[PDB]
Symmetry: C3
Subunit: 337 residues, 3 copies
């Protein structure tokens, strides 16, 4: 609370990892409050988002879409050093939905190419929160170009269920969902531009339709399927953090459920249970806990099946272990009528 106390707190640098993987942390806080330091360089680059070679001039924190997940405990201070290289052509900033004041920090971190800034904030509330770039006048554009992520502020004493009973996960994954608005020419072919700003006008026209051309996980159609599927084993407890900085989503683990789901993302708000499909509004993050019971492949999707299977909002989970015939059994395999 006092100047003396804050300045005396321990400083601790963390090495970030690209989604859907998460950096090192302890569910239960180790030691007292500390100033957790992170650093992210902003990269403006063209990325291919589908099998048709469709490009997007990405604006990515730490070079990834979405930005990496930052994990701190309640009442710690998140001190982030944001850098916008001279090679970039736009001004960026950052808004932490977890922070209080200055529009989430957006007003204190507006950096042009060739600048860096250091913002500190006390994570006073526990939950998963979205963070995103918000330069005044072109907020949506930056956000829908991939410039968003989320952070997890864990209660000092780890997660718990509705009746105070502790919930300890074995694995944690971060799925950032992105709605893209790529322009098409009169023939229907997606367009490519030299610089980010060149697409500005055409993109906004697409944005106003409120109909994304692609809705993806980890920046691309299929980014989390195939060999890039997330893993687990029967018996394993998994926390799947999910975010959507600009548009609603309805997550669903096909084959499983969300045993405990902090749908609003706030840990002080009791988790719903036995969820089939949960809902996360635009501009929020949510977290679902589940203990795998059956092996095989699972499909984790946005349950608007058109957005999942036509637009690209589908990921996989490869689970190992033994099958349970009490849970499910093929009494009579598909056979002649």
């Amino acid at each position: 609370a006092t100047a003396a106390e804050i300045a005396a707190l321990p400083r601790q640098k963390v090495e970030l990892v690209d989604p859907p993987f998460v950096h090192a942390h302890s569910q239960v806080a180790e030691g007292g409050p500390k100033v957790v330091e992170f650093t992210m360089v902003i990269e403006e680059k063209k990325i291919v988002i589908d099998d048709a070679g469709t490009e997007v001039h990405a604006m990515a924190f730490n070079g990834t879409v979405p930005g990496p997940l930052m994990v701190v405990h309640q009442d710690d201070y998140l001190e982030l050093t944001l850098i916008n290289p001279e090679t970039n052509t736009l001004m960026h900033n950052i808004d932490f939905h977890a922070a209080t004041g200055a529009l989430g920090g957006g007003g204190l971190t507006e950096i042009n190419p060739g600048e860096k800034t250091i913002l500190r904030f006390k994570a006073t509330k526990p939950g998963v929160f979205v963070y995103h770039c918000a330069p005044p006048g072109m907020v949506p554009w930056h956000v829908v170009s991939g410039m968003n992520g989320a952070i997890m502020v864990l209660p000092r004493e780890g997660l718990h269920d509705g009746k105070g009973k502790a919930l300890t996960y074995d694995k944690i994954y971060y799925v950032g969902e992105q709605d893209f608005y790529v322009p098409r020419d009169e023939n229907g072919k997606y367009k490519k531009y030299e610089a980010p700003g060149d697409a500005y006008e055409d993109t906004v026209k697409v944005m106003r339709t409120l109909t994304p051309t692609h809705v993806v996980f980890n920046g691309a159609v299929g980014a989390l399927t195939g060999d890039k599927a997330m893993t687990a084993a029967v018996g394993e407890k998994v926390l799947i953090v999910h975010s959507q900085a600009n548009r609603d989503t309805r997550p669903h683990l096909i084959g499983g459920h969300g045993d405990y789901v902090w749908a609003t993302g706030k840990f002080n708000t009791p988790p719903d249970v036995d969820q089939e499909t949960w809902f996360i509004p635009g501009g929020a993050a949510g977290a679902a806990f589940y203990t795998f019971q059956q092996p095989g492949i699972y499909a984790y999707v946005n349950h608007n099946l058109i957005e999942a299977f036509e637009l690209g909002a589908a990921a996989h989970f490869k689970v190992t272990g033994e099958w349970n015939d009490d849970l499910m059994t093929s009494v009579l395999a598909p056979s002649g009528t």
Copy 2:
């Protein structure tokens, strides 16, 4: 647990009924776990969804859109014999969101025309869940062709409110909301086809716009009105189950309320109370308990009034009873200004 133990469980064959009605069942489980058997034949047929003669090539479970509601209690086993007659042209399967393993069953139930299969799963979680067809690579198409429904896994001891008091209903209705995407020719007239597959290409383009041409209850505009209006009486406690396998909905009982609403559809997640309009994400089912206090006709709708009154999402309830002037009264009937 052991196959031996399950084999010794009493089995019961249940007779399914067309929505909005629900087959006979007991709120409080009568006895120990049983293996509840059901049989549904898949019927591919043309359905007329509006008074303009618009046709949809439905892929209907048990012949109706939505498929019938199956009722079992927690920890019972639901055994379904799914049949895909040789009269059909497509492979179909079934995913129960209430089940655990093999993508909810779809992976163990892929039956081509002229095949059948039998699936058994333990209803481990109490609540209303969605079920739907989901052929690999043709998922949304089958779902938006009306191939979906719901099941209700009641708690053994029946329904209860957040504080444990028993909530016993007098009537139950199942309302399945469907979002259709019907192609139109260059003149804005809805197109008709001679075969399901002939409309595939045309339908996928409409689906991608994420804008349904129709949003209807029980398969057609006006389906649940007039001869198909739901009934009740002042003093009657009614449970309205609602499902939407592909798209969000916001149910509303015009003139009444949602006394208790399990918005997520999961009974272990306490119900919201005194609701005016509840929300159900695409891919889930919710349930609302309400005791009618006033006679007259009510209108149950998706409260995006455009969807409800332009697109077709509206149903009626004809309630009998005595008017309660304490609740509402016309002090001055419409008259001179």
Copy 3:
């Protein structure tokens, strides 16, 4: 119960104020149950919804979009004298979501131009509820023309958190969010019509797209900005009631949080806490309680950033007070890299 017992109740006529302000009231009920009287005259008037001059023929209760907020206590009787002037061309009625019977009151208040009516209903359920016009056959047209508002039925003992601790706000604002569907000409310019009737056909075509041309607060793009910006101070407890009679919204106070959010708008439903972005389904109202901690400008928006910053759903908050460096601080201001 009896008309004699209701007539023996004290009556109090209330003078309404234009949104975002609310007429005077007490959080805790002043004594016992009373019949609270209100009067509103319907005005069909042209309004301008943006800086380019886009006009809409609105259907406004009390001449405002949204209609004013009426405030009463649970078990009070709300007696509304609704007047439809001779200068109006259409018939109108009102559906109170807080009421029980005759389609929320709509069936008993159908008045033509030149008529008036007086409806009384008991405010039996505590919470915020929208009210809107619903002429049979033209329900959505009236609503998306601005003919909706909201009411608040406070618990007779004022607000409390989910654990019983009292929640008393210092100020209260009412944000009515409106989705408009404005036709455009062949050049993309918004169209103007002589009579509201002349706008119907073209407007219906846009409504069916389910993509509004404007999403605004208090009737217009930027209505709640500049000298019309809401105000507060550090330490000030603010209750923000938000409604959307026809379309979903997801409120977010950029730079702040929703400390206690009755997202379903029903006070008997415990509030969520520490919310970053909440959700209010079309056809409902919600309420958020927040104690300001930092000074400066805040943007209160619907967090689908395209809706917020392209469609018009952004309001501002001007907050006085001392900056809190503990909560947030610029360790290094934007500077050389």
